[PDB]
Structure 1
Amino acid sequence: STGSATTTPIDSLDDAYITPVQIGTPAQTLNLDFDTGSSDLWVFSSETTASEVDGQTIYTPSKSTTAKLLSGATWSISYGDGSSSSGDVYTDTVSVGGLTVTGQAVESAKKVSSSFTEDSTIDGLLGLAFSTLNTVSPTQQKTFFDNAKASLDSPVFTADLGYHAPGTYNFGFIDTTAYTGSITYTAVSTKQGFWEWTSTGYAVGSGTFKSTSIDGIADTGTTLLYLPATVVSAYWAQVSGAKSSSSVGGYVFPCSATLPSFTFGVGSARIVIPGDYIDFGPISTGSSSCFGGIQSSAGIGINIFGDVALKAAFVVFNGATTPTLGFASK
């Protein structure tokens, strides 16, 4: 089997991407944030505290003839940005782009933190990291991909995120029309539950490539590119007037700037992030200070190849017995 679904930016800055997902019988379609950095499929629901729902579409398990309470199961997750959610668990039928999993754990939110409430466009998360990170207790549950994998034509999914435009998540096949040149594959460590890999270095603009190992995670659920402070400083030093602002919470730059590209290495191959991908717009409405898309990972504790990086590539999440990651230009 295979599946193919379009993923769409939630706003004009590509702050996140949503993908329609069918849950239950009859189908209830929710727009979920596909997140290769976590492993819970959770949704706003009829059980979510009313004051914490503000415009999201909810899953109502009582209206699904295939929903079953997973008795005694609870979940609770906290993400790197301090956001969180928790609740109980149903199993139900879940379909993405024509690919169907029966008995998928659908984690129903009883509580969500303020940033989730405040984002009316995201109805939940669909985790695509390794199932070892799943938070369901006392019986850990599998991700949608883990459940689908054996049925897929090939045990892979691909992320093809757009810049200020829709893109595609495919399951079970590699669309050879969706990228240019060849796909370069690179090793993955699953030890921390992430799609963790090591970039071979970077360049800023037309500058020379610096060969240096950068361990980090391929994370569609993080907006920006978070890298070591040394790398980030080298980038922003090429932008007149750019500075790290403690009050704003990262590097800002004059909105009048033309940003340089940023290149990262994948083995001997190179992925080029155009300068415009690194512009996240005014820090507040009407400001001439703009927020940068490349930020320091210092104090996160891990480097993160988030959407800013991934959207410059066609990315293969290869779930073979020994997982690997593939990157192609597009």
Structure 2
Amino acid sequence: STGSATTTPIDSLDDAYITPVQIGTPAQTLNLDFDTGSSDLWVFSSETTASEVDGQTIYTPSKSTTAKLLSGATWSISYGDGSSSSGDVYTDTVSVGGLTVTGQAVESAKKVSSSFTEDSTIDGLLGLAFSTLNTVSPTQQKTFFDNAKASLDSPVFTADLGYHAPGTYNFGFIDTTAYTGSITYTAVSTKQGFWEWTSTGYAVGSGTFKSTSIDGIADTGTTLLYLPATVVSAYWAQVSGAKSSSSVGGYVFPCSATLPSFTFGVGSARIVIPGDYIDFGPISTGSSSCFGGIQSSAGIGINIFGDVALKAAFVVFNGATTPTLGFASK
């Protein structure tokens, strides 16, 4: 089997992408944030504290004839950005772009962090990291991809995120028309539960490539590119007027400035992030100071290849027995 669904940015800055997901019988369609940095499928629901719902579409298990309470099961998660949520668990039918999993754990939110309430366009998350990170207790649950894997024509999914435009998630096949050149594959460590790999280095604009190992995660659920402070400093040094602002919480720059591209290495191959992708606009409405899309990972504890980097490539998440990652230009 295969599936294919369009993913759409939630706003003009590509802060995140939402993908429609059918849950239950009859189908309830929710717009979920596909997150390769986590492993819970959780949704706003009829069970969510009313004061914590503000515009989101909810899942109502009682209206689904295929929903079954997973008795005794609870879940609770906190994300790298200080967000969180918690609740109970049903199993139900979940379909993504034509691909159907029966018995998928659907985690029903009883409580969500303010940040989720405040984002009316995201109805929940669909985690695509490794199932070892799943928070359901006492019995850990599998991700949508893990459940679908054996049925898929090939045990892969691909992320093809757009710049200021929609993109595509595919399951079970590689669309050879979606990228240029070849796909370079690189090794993955699952030891932290992430799609963790090692970039071979970077260049800033037309600068010479610096060969150096950068360990990080491919995370569709994170907006920006977070890299070591040395790297980030080398980038912003090439932008006139840029500075790191503690009050703002990162590098900012005047929008009159031209942003250089940023190249990262995948084995011997090279992915170029155009400068325009690194502009995240005014820090506040009307400000002349713009927020940068490349920021320091210092004190995150891990480097994150977020949407800023991934949207510059066609990315293969290969769930073969030994997982790997593939990157192609497009």
| TM-score bucket (shorter structure) | over 0.9
Query: Could you tell me how far apart the structure 2 residues matched to 1:124 and 1:257 are?
Result: 36
SS in 1 for 2:146: helix
Query: Could you tell me how far apart the structure 1 residues matched to 2:75 and 2:130 are?
Result: 16
> TM-score if structure 1 supplies the norm length?
1.00
Kindly provide the CA deviation profile for residues 78-122 of structure 1, in whole angstroms up to 9, marking residues without a partner as x.
000000000000000000000000000000000000000000000
SS in 2 for 1:259: coil
Deviation, 1:274, is 0.1
Q: Where do residues 244-283 of structure 1 align in structure 2 (5 Å cutoff)?
A: 244-283=244-283
SS in 2 for 1:85: strand
Kindly provide the CA deviation profile for residues 258-294 of structure 1, in whole angstroms up to 9, marking residues without a partner as x.
1000000000000000000000000000000000000
Query: Which residue pairs with 2:77 in the alignment?
Result: 77
Regions of 4+ moved over 3 Å: none
Deviation, 1:198, is 0.1
Query: Could you tell me how far apart the structure 2 residues matched to 1:259 and 1:87 are?
Result: 43
Query: Could you tell me how far apart the structure 2 residues matched to 1:297 and 1:112 are?
Result: 26
SS in 1 for 2:51: helix
Query: Which residue pairs with 2:317 in the alignment?
Result: 317
Query: Could you tell me how far apart the structure 2 residues matched to 1:138 and 1:253 are?
Result: 48
> TM-score if structure 2 supplies the norm length?
1.00
Kindly provide the CA deviation profile for residues 42-82 of structure 1, in whole angstroms up to 9, marking residues without a partner as x.
00000000000000000000000000000000000000000
Deviation, 1:255, is 1.2
Query: Could you tell me how far apart the structure 2 residues matched to 1:79 and 1:30 are?
Result: 21
SS in 2 for 1:111: strand
- Equivalent pairs, count: 330
Deviation, 1:222, is 0.2
Query: Could you tell me how far apart the structure 1 residues matched to 2:109 and 2:280 are?
Result: 30
Query: Could you tell me how far apart the structure 1 residues matched to 2:158 and 2:16 are?
Result: 17
Gaps in structure 2 of 5+ consecutive residues: none
SS in 1 for 2:220: coil
Kindly provide the CA deviation profile for residues 274-328 of structure 1, in whole angstroms up to 9, marking residues without a partner as x.
0000000000000000000000000000000000000000000000000000000
SS in 1 for 2:81: coil
SS in 1 for 2:150: helix
Query: Could you tell me how far apart the structure 1 residues matched to 2:27 and 2:57 are?
Result: 13
Kindly provide the CA deviation profile for residues 194-230 of structure 1, in whole angstroms up to 9, marking residues without a partner as x.
0000000000000000000000000000000000000
Query: Which residue pairs with 2:224 in the alignment?
Result: 224
| Cα RMSD, aligned residues only | 0.2
Query: Could you tell me how far apart the structure 2 residues matched to 1:329 and 1:23 are?
Result: 34
Query: Could you tell me how far apart the structure 1 residues matched to 2:304 and 2:238 are?
Result: 22
Deviation, 1:177, is 0.1
Query: Could you tell me how far apart the structure 2 residues matched to 1:279 and 1:143 are?
Result: 33
SS in 2 for 1:194: coil
Query: Could you tell me how far apart the structure 2 residues matched to 1:165 and 1:227 are?
Result: 25
Query: Which residue pairs with 1:31 in the alignment?
Result: 31
SS in 1 for 2:277: helix
Query: Could you tell me how far apart the structure 2 residues matched to 1:8 and 1:243 are?
Result: 31
Gaps in structure 1 of 5+ consecutive residues: none
Query: Could you tell me how far apart the structure 1 residues matched to 2:299 and 2:79 are?
Result: 14
Identity of aligned residues (%): 100
Query: Could you tell me how far apart the structure 1 residues matched to 2:57 and 2:248 are?
Result: 32
